[PDB]
């Protein structure tokens, strides 16, 4: 019975001769463990893609074998084998994709993670106002933590800082290679203020927070009236966009209605 | 949506710019890779932008073709069935665009959109399909919709669509 | 700590030799000792894998923080070049 | 994750084998030993991948130092 295992390893080491000399579950288990040993030797010693094509031609366990191969090969050959998997198209696929998401640091591999998620979707000096920096990014952390937006004192700081930042935004009145995340730079501070698109990001984030608050977990009705007043002022400031203020405002109204639709159905 | 706010904010503000397609594709892939974005919800955002922007047609058509080259074709059918069950002539406009140029799918949308009630109304005589016949004529697909024989011609606006054609 | 300093595969080779000796004897206490050694080797392999994964995750987080700082500096330099 | 369950199943199969039939049990025990050797080789490859990832992180830190030097040169050019 291990003599049959050695005969199987002689026959597999081309593929048509292995299929001829291969000729009922334990024999297939010995065959699959022979493929395990040969793939482990090839990982010790491209050819892995050829053996995966051989298993896909002959034949469960190739998911485990590809998971072992993706666990071994870190960065480049993992990318080529994932392009091979994209050319190929149960729970083992989700486990491999979760391992690829957890191992990558998303510093420059965000494109590869997006391809993974598309595959899963196919499956299923100068005077610097440092106080402005501190208040603005404390509000940004308030956006990051809506769970913190339920208390009293944190809500009071949110009220004060939000009214001061919106007062600065109303008082500015501008009237006119890719950067992934927000730039927490105390040095320049003026190119973000001169760019109206950054304020569009911030006011969209305000509108999403306001729609979430409208969507325990109770608030004062006066706070809700304040939210509605500031929401109407946000619609006023987004109507002040010199390229298509009212048009993009109606676009955001339609998007808010559709977000309400997606919430109330699900 | 309730966890990743900056990602959808960046999607809407990047689709909110004034008019390069592949650079915006790279930006969408970067936002999906950074903020763990659901690709179906990103597709919903792109479709609702194309509803709210009827000006730049073929640009967003090319973006949807390059996006749906990496996905399954039935996903747009289930999304349009979901949006038709959610309810607005912009829905009929985007369905007429997506059933004329490419990705044409008549059977599944007819399943998602009444037949025995229409037969009983035709026997007693002797909503959104009519809007699709309005927006589609605004051609062989309409003839496939035609097969009561004179129920569409019994409405005035369908006759106005055919007469403008 | 101590098992990470001592590491490894020689214990697996000794377990394989004990398995070969037990299969030759089958054609007692050695089988129990080999099973206990196999369980201890599996636990040590899982612990070493968890420690290596934690160290790799710490290095990846530190490299991601350094890459984010360098990308912020390069983005500030690119914005200063685009301003002029 | 799944390797721990496989190791526990191998230990349970070894305990059941210690508890034609003997030859089939010896073949199953040799199969479990081969699976355990494959798991040990996967653990060794994971340790080598962790060392290579630490080396790549050190290379990324050196590239970050070179990018900081390039950022200073770009500050002079700015």
Numbering used by the authors:
A (entry chain A): 10 to 22, 29 to 38, 44 to 65, 71 to 84, 91 to 120, 133 to 167, 227 to 278, 296 to 334, ...
B (entry chain B): 165 to 183, 188 to 255, 263 to 288, 295 to 307, 343 to 354, 358 to 366, 369 to 386
C (entry chain E): 41 to 47, 55 to 74, 81 to 137
D (entry chain G): 21 to 39, 44 to 102
Sentences from the paper on this structure:
The human THO complex comprises six subunits, THOC1, −2, –3, −5, –6, and −7, of which four have known counterparts in the yeast Saccharomyces cerevisiae (Sc): THOC1 (yeast Hpr1), −2 (yeast Tho2), −3 (yeast Tex3), and −7 (yeast Mft1).
Here, we present the cryo-electron microscopy (cryo-EM) structure of the human THO–UAP56 complex at 3.3 Å resolution. Each monomer is partitioned into two regions, one formed by THOC1, −2, –3, and UAP56 and the second by THOC5, −6, and −7. THOC1, −2, –3, and UAP56 adopt the same architecture in all monomers, whereas THOC5, −6, –7 assume different conformations to assemble the dimer via THOC5 and THOC7 and the tetramer via THOC5 and THOC6. The THO–UAP56 tetramer assembles from dimer 1 and 2 via two interfaces that involve the THOC5 and THOC6 subunits. We observed density for the UAP56 RecA2 lobe, but not RecA1, which remains mobile in the absence of RNA and ATP.
